[PDB]
Each structure stands twice: as C-alpha cells, then as structure tokens.
Amino acid sequence: SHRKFSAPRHGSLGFLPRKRSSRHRGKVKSFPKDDPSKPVHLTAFLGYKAGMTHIVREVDRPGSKVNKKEVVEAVTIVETPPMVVVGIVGYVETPRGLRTFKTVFAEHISDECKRRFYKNWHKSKKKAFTKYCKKWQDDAGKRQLDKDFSSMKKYCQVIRVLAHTQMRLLPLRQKKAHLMEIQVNGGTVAEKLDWARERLEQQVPVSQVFGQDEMIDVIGVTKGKGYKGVTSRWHTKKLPRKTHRGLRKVACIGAWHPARVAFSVARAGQKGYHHRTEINKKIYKIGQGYLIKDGKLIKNNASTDYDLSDKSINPLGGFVHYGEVTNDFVMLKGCVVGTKKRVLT
Amino acid sequence: MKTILSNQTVDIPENVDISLKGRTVIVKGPRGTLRRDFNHINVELSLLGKKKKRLRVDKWWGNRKELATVRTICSHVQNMIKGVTLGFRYKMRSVYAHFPINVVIQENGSLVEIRNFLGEKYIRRVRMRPGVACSVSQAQKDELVLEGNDIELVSNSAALIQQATTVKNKDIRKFLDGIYVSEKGTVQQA
Amino acid sequence: VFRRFVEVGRVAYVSFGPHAGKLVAIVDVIDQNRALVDGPCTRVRRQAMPFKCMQLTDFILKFPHSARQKYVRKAWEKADINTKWAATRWAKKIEARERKAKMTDFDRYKVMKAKKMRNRIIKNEVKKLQRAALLKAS
Amino acid sequence: QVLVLDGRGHLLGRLAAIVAKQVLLGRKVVVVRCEGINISGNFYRNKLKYLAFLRKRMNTNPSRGPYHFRAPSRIFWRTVRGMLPHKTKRGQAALDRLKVFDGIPPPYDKKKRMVVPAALKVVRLKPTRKFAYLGRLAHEVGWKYQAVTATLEEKRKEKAKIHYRKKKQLMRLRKQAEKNVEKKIDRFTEVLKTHGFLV
RNA sequence: GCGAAGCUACCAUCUGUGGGAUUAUGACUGAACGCCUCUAAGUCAGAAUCCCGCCCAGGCGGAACGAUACGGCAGCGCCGCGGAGCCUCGGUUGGCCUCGGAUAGCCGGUCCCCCGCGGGGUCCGGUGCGGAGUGCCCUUCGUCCUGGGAAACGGGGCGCGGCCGGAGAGGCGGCCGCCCCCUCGCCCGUCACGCACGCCGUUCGUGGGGAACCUGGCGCUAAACCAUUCGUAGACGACCUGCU
RNA sequence: CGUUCAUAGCGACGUCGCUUUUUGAUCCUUCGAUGUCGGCUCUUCCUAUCAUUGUGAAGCAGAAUUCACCAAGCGUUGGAU
RNA sequence: ACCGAACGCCGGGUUAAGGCGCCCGAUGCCGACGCUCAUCAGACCCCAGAAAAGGUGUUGGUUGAUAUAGACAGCAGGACGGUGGCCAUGGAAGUCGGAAUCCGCUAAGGAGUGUGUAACAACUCACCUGCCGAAUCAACUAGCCCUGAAAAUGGAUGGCGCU
Numbered sequence A: 001s002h003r004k005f006s007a008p009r010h011g012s013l014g015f016l017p018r019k020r021s022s023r024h025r026g027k028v029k030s031f032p033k034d035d036p037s038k039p040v041h042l043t044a045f046l047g048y049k050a051g052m053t054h055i056v057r058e059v060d061r062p063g064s065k066v067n068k069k070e071v072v073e074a075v076t077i078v079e080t081p082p083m084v085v086v087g088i089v090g091y092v093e094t095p096r097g098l099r100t101f102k103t104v105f106a107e108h109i110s111d112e113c114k115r116r117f118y119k120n121w122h123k124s125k126k127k128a129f130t131k132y133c134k135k136w137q138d139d140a141g142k143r144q145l146d147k148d149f150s151s152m153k154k155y156c157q158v159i160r161v162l163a164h165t166q167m168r169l170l171p172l173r174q175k176k177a178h179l180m181e182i183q184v185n186g187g188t189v190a191e192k193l194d195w196a197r198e199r200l201e202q203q204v205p206v207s208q209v210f211g212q213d214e215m216i217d218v219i220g221v222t223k224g225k226g227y228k229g230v231t232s233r234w235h236t237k238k239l240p241r242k243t244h245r246g247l248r249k250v251a252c253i254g255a256w257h258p259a260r261v262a263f264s265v266a267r268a269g270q271k272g273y274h275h276r277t278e279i280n281k282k283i284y285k286i287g288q289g290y291l292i293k294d295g296k297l298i299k300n301n302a303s304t305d306y307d308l309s310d311k312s313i314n315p316l317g318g319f320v321h322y323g324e325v326t327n328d329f330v331m332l333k334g335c336v337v338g339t340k341k342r343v344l345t
Numbered sequence B: 001m002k003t004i005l006s007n008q009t010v011d012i013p014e015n016v017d018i019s020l021k022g023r024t025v026i027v028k029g030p031r032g033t034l035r036r037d038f039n040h041i042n043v044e045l046s047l048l049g050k051k052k053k054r055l056r057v058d059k060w061w062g063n064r065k066e067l068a069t070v071r072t073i074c075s076h077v078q079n080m081i082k083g084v085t086l087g088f089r090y091k092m093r094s095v096y097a098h099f100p101i102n103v104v105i106q107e108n109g110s111l112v113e114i115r116n117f118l119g120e121k122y123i124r125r126v127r128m129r130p131g132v133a134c135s136v137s138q139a140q141k142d143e144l145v146l147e148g149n150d151i152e153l154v155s156n157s158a159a160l161i162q163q164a165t166t167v168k169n170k171d172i173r174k175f176l177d178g179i180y181v182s183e184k185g186t187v188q189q190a
Numbered sequence C: 001v002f003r004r005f006v007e008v009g010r011v012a013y014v015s016f017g018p019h020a021g022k023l024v025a026i027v028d029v030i031d032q033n034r035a036l037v038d039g040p041c042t043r044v045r046r047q048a049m050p051f052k053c054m055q056l057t058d059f060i061l062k063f064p065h066s067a068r069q070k071y072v073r074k075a076w077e078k079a080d081i082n083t084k085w086a087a088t089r090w091a092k093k094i095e096a097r098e099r100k101a102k103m104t105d106f107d108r109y110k111v112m113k114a115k116k117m118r119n120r121i122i123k124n125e126v127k128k129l130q131r132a133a134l135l136k137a138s
Numbered sequence D: 001q002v003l004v005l006d007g008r009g010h011l012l013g014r015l016a017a018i019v020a021k022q023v024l025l026g027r028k029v030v031v032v033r034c035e036g037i038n039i040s041g042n043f044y045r046n047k048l049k050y051l052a053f054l055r056k057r058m059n060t061n062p063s064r065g066p067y068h069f070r071a072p073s074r075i076f077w078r079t080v081r082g083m084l085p086h087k088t089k090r091g092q093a094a095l096d097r098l099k100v101f102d103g104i105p106p107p108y109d110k111k112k113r114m115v116v117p118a119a120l121k122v123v124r125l126k127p128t129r130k131f132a133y134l135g136r137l138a139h140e141v142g143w144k145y146q147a148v149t150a151t152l153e154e155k156r157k158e159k160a161k162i163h164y165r166k167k168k169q170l171m172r173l174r175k176q177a178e179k180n181v182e183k184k185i186d187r188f189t190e191v192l193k194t195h196g197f198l199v
Numbered sequence E: 001g002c003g004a005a006g007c008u009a010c011c012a013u014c015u016g017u018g019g020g021a022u023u024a025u026g027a028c029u030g031a032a033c034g035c036c037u038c039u040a041a042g043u044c045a046g047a048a049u050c051c052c053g054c055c056c057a058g059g060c061g062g063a064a065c066g067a068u069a070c071g072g073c074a075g076c077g078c079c080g081c082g083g084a085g086c087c088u089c090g091g092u093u094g095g096c097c098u099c100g101g102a103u104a105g106c107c108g109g110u111c112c113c114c115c116g117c118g119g120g121g122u123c124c125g126g127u128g129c130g131g132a133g134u135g136c137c138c139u140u141c142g143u144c145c146u147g148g149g150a151a152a153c154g155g156g157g158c159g160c161g162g163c164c165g166g167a168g169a170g171g172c173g174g175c176c177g178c179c180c181c182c183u184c185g186c187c188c189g190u191c192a193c194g195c196a197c198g199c200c201g202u203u204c205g206u207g208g209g210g211a212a213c214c215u216g217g218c219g220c221u222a223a224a225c226c227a228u229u230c231g232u233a234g235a236c237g238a239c240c241u242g243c244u
Numbered sequence F: 001c002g003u004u005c006a007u008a009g010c011g012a013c014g015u016c017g018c019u020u021u022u023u024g025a026u027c028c029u030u031c032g033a034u035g036u037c038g039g040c041u042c043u044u045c046c047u048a049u050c051a052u053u054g055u056g057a058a059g060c061a062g063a064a065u066u067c068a069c070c071a072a073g074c075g076u077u078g079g080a081u
Numbered sequence G: 001a002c003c004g005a006a007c008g009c010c011g012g013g014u015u016a017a018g019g020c021g022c023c024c025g026a027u028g029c030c031g032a033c034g035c036u037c038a039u040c041a042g043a044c045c046c047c048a049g050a051a052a053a054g055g056u057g058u059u060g061g062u063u064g065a066u067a068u069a070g071a072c073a074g075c076a077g078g079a080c081g082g083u084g085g086c087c088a089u090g091g092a093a094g095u096c097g098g099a100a101u102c103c104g105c106u107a108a109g110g111a112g113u114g115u116g117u118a119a120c121a122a123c124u125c126a127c128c129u130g131c132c133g134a135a136u137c138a139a140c141u142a143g144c145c146c147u148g149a150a151a152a153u154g155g156a157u158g159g160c161g162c163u
C-alpha cells in the first residue's frame, strides 16, 4: 500500500557517495568562463580558516524593516598570506575533454613547495627539480623553454598558473605548502601566457584577486565526524522508547519486491569530511597584515573609521585552536566549510 | 497515384532578374536581393526565355502530397519577386478601452518597447527579424508600420508584437486589446 | 534538370538481364515502370521491358509510337546507330573493360612491363616540370 | 589491411549491421565521423526513442544499470555491440577490432576512407522521408563536445583542401607531362590500350 | 551552584544559481482545394517538463611534469651495431586524405572582374552509367655474366649535417648542403647459377612482442612503505602533519 | 435539462470499453508451516491532477469558476473519538 | 499439450514445419507489383492483447449528380407581397411549439434555415447575373495510418535495429 501521510524525503541524493573525500584541499570543479575581452586576472586563491567573530554594520536595503539600522553579523577570518607562482600549465580542447598539454615550471622553487613533492622529507635528499633547473641557464634549455611557450601560444586554449602557499608565514604546524592550479581568465592566450610568464616566482597577494563587497565561492572539506548512525547522518526520525532492537534506526529499509535495498535508503556511514562548494559568501573586509615602517602597524586590521583603536582581528588569547593572524586576511559573511586551520579555496 | 508530370510557370517582370544556383533561387531588383533555398522541395527549377522572362517548375511522377509543393514553390517565388519590386508593408493598429498602448521604436526598426499595455508595469521589448524595420506612422494615431522585402520575416515580426500584447486570465471577448495587423499592403503600388 | 528522356524513339543501353549489353529503342511506354521495346538490328526481340534494367543513351531515333518493327529497323539503319554507338566514349570504355577481362597471363605480363617503363618516363618528366615551375617561382 | 569507413551519410543500424559481420570475420574496422551518421525517422521521433533508453535504469542502484553513452561514437559502438555475441570470448574479441571516433582524428585524417553504399542515406531512404543527424541527437541528450568536434573539423577540412590543391596540381602536371612525352611513350601507350586501359 | 574547551539546536547563524530542445498551446508564410486553412514541403514564440550546466562521486580510461636506487656488493637510461636462446603468436605488396552533391555533379581555362602563388565569380571548352574510374591506382616476382639498341643522372651507403610543416590520440613526413660508391627501368642478343631425378606446411611484415644472456660510447646517482610523531582524521585500515 | 439553445455544463431509453486500489467466482502454487489486522518508521513508482508552472472552455465583466490539454517537478499538515 | 516429425551407433545426399540485415546456417537476387509515416508505427497458428464510434490523413471502389442553355466555388446585388395566413393570446404578423402549407409578382424568395425579439424591427440563410477559366460535388463503401487508448522496480516485434 501507499505510505499514508506524505512527507518530503530526508537528505539529498545530489550529494552522494557520502564518503570521506579523497582530497583534503578542496578542488575548484569549475572556473568561471573567461570572456576574452576584460583584462587578465586570477580566478582563485587559497586561504586558511583561522576563526569566526562579530561585525556590526549599518545596512542599506531600502524597504526592509532593518534599513539604516545597525545589525550585527557573524564573519569568518580566512588568513590568506600571499601565494607564489611557480608554474604555468597549458591545456588544449579535445573532443575527449581538456588535455593538459605542457607544464613549464619556474627556476627557483622553495622548500615550502618542494616539501609537497616528497612523502618523507626528513628521509629524502631533496633532489626534486634538480635536473630541471639546469634548463634555465644555458642556450639549449632556454631555447627549448621558449619553443614550449611558443607551442602553448600556438595550440593551448586554457592556461592555469600553478601557485602555492607560503606555509612559512602561518601559525600552523605544517611546512608542506599547498600547490594548486589557478586559471588565468582574460584576453588572448598569447597575452594571457606572457602575463603568467612575468609573474613567475613572484608573490601574489589577496587584494590582486579579490575586492571588497564581492560574492565569492568558498570551496573546502567539511569538518569530519567519523562513523555516524542514520539518525545523525540522515536526520531520520528516532523511533520511540519501546523499540526492542534500538531506536536510532530506520524501521523499513525497503519494500519486499524490488528485492534489494536501494541507494536512496538511509544507512549509517561516514558523516563529514566531504567536499563542498558553498557559494555567495560576501567579502566584508580584505584586511591588511602587520607591517613595519618604524614600529608595528597592528591597527590596520580590526580598526574601523568609526572605532579608531589599535586592534588586530586577533582576539585576546588569539583565535582558539589556531594562532595569531599576522598576515593579510579576508573577512567573509557567515560560516564556511571545515575546521579551524583548514586550507580553503 | 503517380502523376506522370506536373508543372507551373512564374512570369518574372522585366525590372527583376532572377537567378538559380541549382534549386536556390536568388531574386534581385529595385529594393534588394532575396535568396531562398528549396533543397527540401525536390523539383526541376528550369529557367527559360530570352530576356529570362519565366521561371518554370516541373515535378515528375508526383503523388498528391508531392504535387502539393509545386504551386507553393511557384508562389514563394512570386512573393520573393513582389518583395524585391514593391516590398511589403504590414500595418497594425493598436486597440484599447483605457490604457493607450504606448509604442516606441528604438535602434532603427529593430526594437519595439510596448509600454502601459492594460496598465502593466512590464515594458515589452520586441526585436524585429533582420531586414524588417518598424516605424511609428503619421496620418493615423494608434498604428504601426512594418516594412521589408522578405514577407516571411515581416509577418513573423508583426506576430511577434501581436502575441507580445496578449491578455492572460481574463475574458478575451471582453478585453479586446493589443496591436493587431490591420492591413497587408506594399511599400509602393505602381 | 533532365537531359535524357523516356521518349518514344529513345535508344537505351540495357545494363543487365537476358539482353545485357545491347541497344534497344523504346517503341511504346506501357506503364509507370515498363516499356514496350525493340532492338531489330541489335538482336533483341520486340518485348516489354522494365525501366529498372535499361539505362538510356543520347540517341532519339524518330519513328511513330507503335510502328511494326520494319519501320524502326529503317530508322535505326538510316541513322546508323550501330556506327554512332561504337563511336561513343561510353561504348569505347565498355570495349576497354571487356578487353581487360579477356587479358591472358602473358598479355598481363607484357602490360606490366609496358607500364613499368611508361610510368617511369612520365614520372621523370613530371619531376622536370616541377623543377621548371620552381625555377619560374624563384 | 584495415577498413576505415566515413560514418557520414550512412544509416545507424544499417551500417552497424555490415560492420558487425566484417568485425566477426576478423576484419579490423575503423568507423570515423560518427556524429555524421544519420538515423531514419524524423528528429523528434528518435529523441524520444533515446530519452526512453535513458529512463531504463536499475532502480535500486543506477551506478550498475545500463550505461547510456552520449557521444555519437559510443552510441554507434553500442548499436554494433548489439549485433555481436558480445558475452562470448569471440564476441568480445570481435568488438576489440572495431574502433569508433567522433570526428576524424590523426591516424585516419590522412587515410582514404570508404563508404558502405548499402548503408547510405541517399540510397536507402526515399528523398521525401525524414531523418535525424546522430550529432544533434547526441548533443541534446547530453553530449558535451559538439562544438569542439566542429571546431576541430573545420581545421581538418581547411588542412585537407590544401592537400587536394597540391594533388590536383600534380595530376595537372602529369596530364601535361604525357603530352610533352607522347612520341617516346607511344609504343608503350599503344600496348596499354590493346589490352584495354586508357580508353 | 557556576562552568573552559569540544560536540550540538529553525533553540543560535550563514548559502541554495544558468542554458538548450521542445510539449500543450497560439502564430507566420503556404499549397493540397483559381478561395480558405498553423501544415502538407517550409518558419516563429513556448513551459514547475525533458537534457545539460552548476553540485557530488570519479572507469581494469587517459594527462603533463618531477625524481628516478654510488656503493659498502649495485642496478639501470639512451645510442648504435653484433652472437646465441626460451616463449607468444596473428600475418604472407602497398594506396600519403578535398568537400560534398544527389530534381546533380567533375575538370579545365580564363579573354574579364573581385579578394588574400592561391581563394571567389562570371563566361566559354571538355567529361558525366563516372578511364583525372577503388569495375581504380602504385609497385614487380628469379641471380648473375657480356655487348648492342631505346630510355639516361637516377639510385644507394639503416651515407652524414641544417631548415621546415605536423598537437585531436602529432608521431610522421617533407625540403636544403657534403663524402664515397654504383649504371639499376624497356627491348634484344649471350651464357651460366645443385638440373636434388612428378608431390605438404614454400614465399614476407621480421632486426616482430615478451623473458633470460655476451660487446662498445655517453649518462645516472632513489624514492616508497614500516617504525616514530601529529589530530584539521579516525572502529581498524586509511587520511592530514612533524623529525641536522 | 440548461429562460431561449441536444452537446458551456449536463444527459434518459440504449450501447461499446478499460481497470484490478472493491467484492465475488475459481482452486493452479504452498499444510516435513511463505508469521496471520492495524498503527509507527522509510524508500520508491503510478496517474485515473487536489495545489503549484504553461495553456484552450464557458451559461469567463472583475472576483470567484467549473470543463478540458501538456504534465507526477515539487507538495499534500496539526489534533478530538 | 502448437506445427513438422517420432529416436540403435556413424558418412554422404534430400527434405518438412520454419527461415535467410547482424546476433544466427541461408537472398551479398540489380527479385516483381502495390500499399503505409505513426510527438503510442508495424512486424506471422496455438500466443500472450483491444471495441463501439470517428478522421478531405492517403489509396482504391460503388452509386448518383453537374456543366458551355460556358457551371463550380471565391467576392458583389435582392430575399417580396395575398398576410397579424391559421391554431395558439402568454406572446409567434416566417421564426417557444404543432395542423398546415398554396397562389400572385414572378428573375425569384420557404406561409420559412437560423440570429434574435414580449412581439416586431434589424440582420442572416434560393433564382439570376459581373469578373475569373475545366472539370466540379455529393452520399456511401473498404485498405493502410491516426483518435478512441489510464498503473504502479527499468524493458522488451527475442535483442540490436529497420522507413
């Protein structure tokens, strides 16, 4: 028979195999469409979730009851010390897909970055890109390099820069800096490539990518919660007190006669550490890091035009389970995916 | 059954010159060219006469629904010729019992904003098919003029503004409003 | 945009059938898809014959739609259709194709030897022509 | 030793039928420009027919169930797979000979490629009948790479037009060359038309 | 009582997107049926639909790049050219390409005009059951000798250096210098090659694919896993980290 | 019948069907046992569409509406006995 | 359980009933003549599926017309009087209904097809022309196709497919 009283089903199928994500660093599953017209730029950045807090602000949506009324608002601080471009990598369209075509790496590469390439650095002799960097100082290599760049100019369509974090400048334990491909979206590919060829080995700060009051999409891995029962993982009804074989369960898995249990039925498994791309998180504040002209400039963070004190976004006793945000940071509205310390695209 | 042969003729006028790359008539004259393809109609577009005076269209071994095309090709070339020579002029009068459908052309003919239809805040923007050019007429108060060579494109663009101005969830017998085609004439008569 | 027609008096080459490789005049059309046919000079008895098998030439000899065979025999021999047909490029490349089938093993060998050489001569003359064309371009 | 068949202008099942038997007799086949395969019956007709096939899925776990391939190459492969005993070893071996492509890629873009005239649309259909391009069909059912396949084929056709122009240029010189030489190839050229070429 | 951290609640807070094809429908041009008709050929608008997008997972599916075992015995990467010796087999000339049309096409040449030696046009001349034909083309299939003719500067030395074109899965060509050697296609003469005594898997792609073994030249100088550690992770594995 | 008007909506006397969410027939399967009602819980499908999108109809002026089409995407609740 | 055919163990031949795109032995015939396009096509005894009733969809028939005294549609001109005819008054002078139901003028108009009216009016529906230029039109009938035609895991002309 039909189910008596209707009700919408628990949880979304548009999110499943509810398994532990392969990646830790959240992948950008699609970069925006590079109109060829507007000038070149980076489309992505890689920050770190340091911590939450309030803001207060005058709101200006006329019509609302809250028009010209100071609301408070939660915010995430994503500590975002500048990335270093250490590569470019050309792609070409095919009917099969979007084949990577040619990867040109920079000359010098940090031990921050080189870390990444070994599973055990203590034990390695740290011999990566050693025979590579020989190319960057001779006639033969430099010529081949130029021909590679020329080929990319002829053939390639999509160009992504490879950059990596400055793990050095953080309060985190790890030294092994996260690399990431970031897509250069702008004018023609020859222009596009000579921009990234100029940026090679160079810093790139956050303000170069993003601007204030800009909607951006946070991409990361969710705060993981291990094995969890169906009542936690699917928010199924608890059964009542009298249930003999437990009550944080689903009673009827399925009907008899599709005589299999379906993929749509709720089962206990991994809850959390999923990959998730939350969109439309408005940047309230791109904050300037500590710097020195004579003494420290700690003010430039959490001081407002109306407050004028000498704060940084660091609270008393620091952000908990994190550190001091001594670098430039963004300040999104609301919560975002993942734990404290988590790398965040 | 299979009719052993059918045909017709299309007497082109001495002003116009028609030419056919196979089965793709191209008709040019006073106002401009008008190409049209008939690869999909399956006929013998012969062109005969010194001074190239008449277009003939055979159709061999046709069955009833195949012989139905013969005249419709012939007729489409007739309109094509008319378009080239005279050019089509569809006139459409606005009608209302209150809200005086405010029309205004924009880029040249292209756009047609149609404001205050039935007291609606929504402003209908209506493009025209490439070639057709709307223009708000004089000598008549609530009345548009769509001119153009390719009749198909004109009458489509007329419809575009006719269906734009449609009444939803009302008694359409009561609510007779919109910009309706009043007259399907020519740009010049001779 | 048709040039050849099932006209009375059209000569048609029969592509296949019992009378394959024979010319034949269309005396009268019986039907949508069947022609009453004759080839008096070409050894083909007066009979109905479907169009599917006949492919039609560029020769319309003129007689009346149901004459009695004698008269088409005259109109064939007046026009001298046998002479004219054998003169045609079509009939030549029929004659060719038959002579390629008749080819014996020694005859096949001779040919190979004759081509082996004849394509060598041309090949050089083409190469000379290319060099001359390159010299003009320079 | 290998068929390459330009799938353009052919009929989907009609070609697949012929390909299957070739493949079963050990003939290695390649089928190229599969988006250009065209299927009898008006477009809408066939879209629904595909969309139905999409609906077919193993209710309890779609991940197992009938994998609906979008690309025209894989579609055509699917229909040829339906005419072999593909559960057998010999059937599986047979398919391994067949090699299908959306568009025409680099080994075969400089190979002459055949046409099965028994599967051809101009022959097998009445001209007043309607049909569908398997491309359009593939596109609307979710094939990602129509436009890419078009942009790569415009290159190829431009690249080929050049080759043909040079080919023509040789042919022309060769026609000139014979005329330049036709008294010192005269008693060869005579013998090649007693045994019936050159006529 | 109060309560840090941590879990956690519409019991707190934040975010939830864009296209395409079209359906029903209403229309255009328009025959059938000298009119008329949304339809027959043709065209338009069109949706909580459907397909994709975004979003999640990621194939006995691919990718570019890095580093590639100095050694205390090592072991390998290329290159070229040699000897044996298991094993796995299929094969038994090649074809190096316009685009497409089908109630049409192919080739020329433009005298003439326009565009970037080509492209487009017109005009004219040829083909069209396609001979600038897959019913096709290319290639030859005994070895040598000498001694004439016609054809004659062509071929080679895994001959050697430079300049190109090729990215869709490039994997292949092309064109230019220099060294040495030869006289090869087509006819004829002129002899000779175990002529193994009528008789089967011959004849090639073949220096084939893989595994194990002897020579030269130039290169190389490891990561991974455990253990330990960490807690962004965790049932256990796994995962993220740290360690002259 | 619907003032008038067979057919907006209806529809007698007659007639042709589909359906297996009713109940009967029937007894083919299972009596070396297929756990016998309801409720809870959960998933999925169907459409014979209540609402929601797009539309044709009216005895649709508006409002309210019934009739029909595409259509099952999304919903369809809290209690008293 | 249908059709064919009834079995010692084997070679060659030939058949039946069934087939011969590919799965799969055989049409890879230059097979013959038609019919039919389906946004639910159809595709073989038993058998696994549809009816009444519809359709200028297309194809055949059958029967009757019509028209040069040049029609048929397509547009344009009139549709009256004897007459509030009679029954019915609740109003029907053509018009809710029903018995009637002819003459005149006639070129010709029914004591009226409808619209609509309390009832008229007003409008609308033959006979004939003007233009145009050969077939036109009606009623049946039976073939394919279509509507009729709604079920629950995703699905079955056996499958792939096929015009």
Ligand SMILES: [Mg+2]
Pocket: A002, A003, A006
């Ligand atoms: Mg329900």
Ligand SMILES: [Mg+2]
Pocket: A242, A243, A244
């Ligand atoms: Mg209990």
Ligand SMILES: [Mg+2]
Pocket: B169, B170
């Ligand atoms: Mg209303």
Ligand SMILES: [Mg+2]
Pocket: E038
């Ligand atoms: Mg329609």
Ligand SMILES: [Mg+2]
Pocket: none
């Ligand atoms: Mg549209």
Ligand SMILES: [Mg+2]
Pocket: none
């Ligand atoms: Mg749309």
Ligand SMILES: [Mg+2]
Pocket: none
């Ligand atoms: Mg998908």
Ligand SMILES: [Mg+2]
Pocket: none
């Ligand atoms: Mg062998």
Ligand SMILES: [Mg+2]
Pocket: none
């Ligand atoms: Mg009544």
Ligand SMILES: [Mg+2]
Pocket: none
């Ligand atoms: Mg029962």
Ligand SMILES: [Mg+2]
Pocket: F034
């Ligand atoms: Mg049980």
Ligand SMILES: [Mg+2]
Pocket: none
């Ligand atoms: Mg329904």
